[PDB]
Amino acid sequence: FAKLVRPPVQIYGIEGRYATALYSAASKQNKLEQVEKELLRVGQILKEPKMAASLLNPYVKRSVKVKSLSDMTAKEKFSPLTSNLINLLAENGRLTNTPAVISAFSTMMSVHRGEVPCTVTTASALDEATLTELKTVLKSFLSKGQVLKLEVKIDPSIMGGMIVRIGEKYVDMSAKTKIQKLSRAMRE
Amino acid sequence: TTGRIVAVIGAVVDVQFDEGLPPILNALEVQGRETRLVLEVAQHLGESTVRTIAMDGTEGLVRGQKVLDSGAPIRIPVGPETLGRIMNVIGEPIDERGPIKTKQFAAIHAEAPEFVEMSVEQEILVTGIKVVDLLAPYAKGGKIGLFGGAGVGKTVLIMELINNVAKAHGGYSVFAGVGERTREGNDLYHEMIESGVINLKDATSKVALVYGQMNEPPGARARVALTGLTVAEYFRDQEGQDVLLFIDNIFRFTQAGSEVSALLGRIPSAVGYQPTLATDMGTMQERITTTKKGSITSVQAIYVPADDLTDPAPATTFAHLDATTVLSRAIAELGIYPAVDPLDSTSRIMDPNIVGSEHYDVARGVQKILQDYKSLQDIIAILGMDELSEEDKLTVSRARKIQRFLSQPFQVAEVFTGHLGKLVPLKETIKGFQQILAGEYDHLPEQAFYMVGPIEEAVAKADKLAEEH
Amino acid sequence: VRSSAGAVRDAGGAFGKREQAEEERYFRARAKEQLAALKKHHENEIS
Amino acid sequence: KTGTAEVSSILEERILGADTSVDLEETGRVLSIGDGIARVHGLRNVQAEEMVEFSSGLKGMSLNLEPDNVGVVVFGNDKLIKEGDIVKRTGAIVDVPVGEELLGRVVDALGNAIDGKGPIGSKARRRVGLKAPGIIPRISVREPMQTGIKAVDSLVPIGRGQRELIIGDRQTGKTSIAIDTIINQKRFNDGTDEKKKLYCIYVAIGQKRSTVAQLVKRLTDADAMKYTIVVSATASDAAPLQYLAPYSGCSMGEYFRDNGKHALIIYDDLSKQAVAYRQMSLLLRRPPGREAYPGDVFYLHSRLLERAAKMNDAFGGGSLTALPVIETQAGDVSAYIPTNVISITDGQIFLETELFYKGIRPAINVGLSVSRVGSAAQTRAMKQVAGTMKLELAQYREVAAFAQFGSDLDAATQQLLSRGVRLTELLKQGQYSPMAIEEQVAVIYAGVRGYLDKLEPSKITKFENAFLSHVISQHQALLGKIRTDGKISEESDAKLKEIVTNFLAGFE
């Protein structure tokens, strides 16, 4: 078979297989950025209430769906890769999980351009200076060229401190866990 | 080629290859293990993944561990240097004596001999056991079965055969322990060292041992039989000589095959066995054969789950054997040892034109008298012995004498009975049973015949019983 | 479903043990008698 | 939901327009391979049960045609097949060679010689999956198929075009029945009567190669290979070959049936063809039924056994007897495959081990044996003696319980027991020593007229022996008269009376 080039992050499931096929197809020939832009475009194109209502009805024949999608793709001037992907999803009847593919490829493209999603959780918000030093130290955690994608949720359930996720790495300096640890130490 | 573990479920490992896939049955080596873990490819799942069964514990495997592809099936060391050693499924030694230094490595998977290689000659192999020699005589180059449940004498009988045939056998010998107690493996190692078949000093060892006991994961039990079979095959071909091949038990091969089938995606069949039971057993039992280039005498112990001879595993195994000796628990309860069932045992050579008309007629007379005894036992349960026709009592007396006279003391069962082992030449067994049937002993009591060699020993035991009466 | 010879003692119920004992007692008695006769023959043939 | 062709390789190919350079009509690429089942992508123009050929020189039969893929069963070890291989159509359903060029040759399930005697002649080919005849070509079974066994020929007659069934346990004598039937046909094949010659086919499914080699030696010893074909599908063979071998044998026999000759095919053993089909079906993920057997297993055996016919003279008059062998377990003829094939066939020769060890070898258990064709498949002389023999044996079987008692019962039951014991000792037979019909009728006639009520039973098996030799040497004219004539004429009856009395008058 054709030795497909594997994506960086492995997505699994039906969306995973379709997205890995698309990523392998795009990586050779080199069209990942353009195909991602086209995928984002079709993200809205199909979302149109008329098109969505006409594509979620399984009683319109697959022939009509494929013809309508060919007309839409021609009317939008896509790469042959995206047009063939939409045709393939339509033939197999996998339109109801099309967004999961566009989502998957996004997750698959973000890692391609080097990104490590991050999460920070605190009892209360932060002052921008402290957020800046967090940015600096977390970028210290990463490697070379690996941009960071910070997210700062606020969880009052914890009683203070901080909780930080960098990919699968996890550091929990929250008051709640220290309280739990010390309390359990007492009871033993 | 280099691949990458992508799943670990029990003993089944899914390995993904970015380059070219390895063919089915190839051996792969996991990189990053302190010991040696070898996976064997069993399926191609598409998308470059291959499913495999691990020949060792899959503990501490990490999704992503690199894997090397050896390019050939599991290749074991073969030759005269394996004699006196012990081995795994993958051929590395487990006797703590250093590397096996051979020049030839043989793959454990091979095609069975073709039809234009079969030997069609049969000649009795005298084992020295009365019941075996009389009713189900073995044959040189033939495959022997030893069916029977648990605790009936399979291991003792096979040890007795190694004591007899193997000790005084010029050719070599191989013993494959497949999924049996490790205690027994150690006991056999030491018993051979004592006897002298395994010589730890010189290079005069006559036995090669392969072990994959019941602590091993199913992958290793399902293949240690093939490893022992490969050693035996080499000694059959290149050495061009007679070989013995003892296997204990060959039901653990089937069972180990059944412990992974459900995880390989196969629907179960029959009583929860893999769908490929008969094919998997045939592709193995068809390499244990006496071609025209050599000659393997194969003795197999076959566990029968719950004494059930109609279970799919023993039922299928029946068709691959020339001789069978169905050890029975109902006879072992009576104290008749070996508990070989005289009516449920058979042999191919048991024909008047191969053994002789005297031997054949004696055997058939014994079987007929025992069957008549069984028919009478139903009546005796209602009447009583006191109400039988004075001829029927004669049948019962002869039948009980013959039932006891088939018992024999082994040289390996000294510990249990405390008696001494006897080897009974074939002519003496035929004479003894012909006389017992002819009536030349209808005055000696039954117990005189219990656990004795030739008939004269029964006469002497009766004399002693009478003197100390 | 059929029946076969030697089935009463294959079940091993109560009739099986009863038959086993009915056989064993009788043949113990006959063994005793035969042993006595064997001793008598021994003595009478010593000379 | 999911499909097996939705793997990312196929989708990758189709996304960048690389699916147009591949001929997905007569070629395919293996998606999966495992446990002897390959799942192939493509082959859009492949017919059900057509044979495809893999790149590595192997063959396979395409059984499951699903929307996504084709399920091929490989004819050998799947060691050589790898995912991504190339599978090409052969274009033709599986067929085998046929003709007189196979006689005396051992072949495998596909007609390839395996005895190393050279290539197989083979002028004509025949598809193994051909519909049997219909209601009309056949005509009632009339001619006898001489088994050469006293019990089978006397109490369980087998005609030509009949489907008997040698059902029994393990090691009871089924293959011995088959081999004696095969060996007894030499007296007809050697002769010149062209409507009595029977050609034999022995299908050996799932037996080890040593057994088949010994069997071929046994046939050669008896000079019974020059008219025998042996089709081996031994244990080491892949499941599809064991599945097909009965059909290859049946087509090699349908050739003889169509061309006016007579054939006898011994599917030994069918309970192993059922197992091979069960494996193939379970690995193709087909829905299991009772005991894990697929739903269409009765169909599997019926479409095979319903090809044993007796064509009428407007088609040639040939015939194809079938003698399927089934190994029951404990004694359970109510299991699944025993039930199917008992409901398919026309009789059953039911063998025992109790009888085998009581000394009644062959262990044919009459009473449970039956032949729904019956007297229609017997000669007139055999009818005459066998009617009385069967009646007397039936009388003896309902008072056999008293045998141990016997004495202290009326005179009628004494006579019944005596006659029954003599008759059973008569039906005993050696091994590989079939008997011509004249010999059988002479022996049974002596037995059933009381001329052995004086002999002790232990001596009967000797009488039967010596007596037979006498007639086979001194009195050949009477035997020839009975044989050619087919009946016992009053003069021949008187001659038999005198012969039996004269020989018995001085025996001791």
Ligand SMILES: Nc1ncnc2c1ncn2[C@@H]1O[C@H](COP(=O)(O)OP(=O)(O)OP(=O)(O)O)[C@@H](O)[C@H]1O
């Ligand atoms: N009529 C007979 N007289 C003497 N011996 C017999 C007779 N029939 C069969 N035997 C012996 O019984 C043994 C078993 O017979 P055979 O193998 O034909 O039965 P089987 O059911 O085909 O065995 P399996 O089914 O296990 O292959 C053989 O060794 C054969 O020689």
Ligand SMILES: Nc1ncnc2c1ncn2[C@@H]1O[C@H](COP(=O)(O)OP(=O)(O)O)[C@@H](O)[C@H]1O
């Ligand atoms: N020849 C014999 N004489 C006396 N007892 C025996 C003999 N063979 C086996 N046994 C009994 O059986 C037991 C061993 O059975 P074994 O053969 O090891 O089990 P299995 O056959 O299930 O592997 C011993 O404890 C012993 O009491």
Ligand SMILES: [Mg+2]
């Ligand atoms: Mg044991």
Ligand SMILES: [Mg+2]
């Ligand atoms: Mg047989």
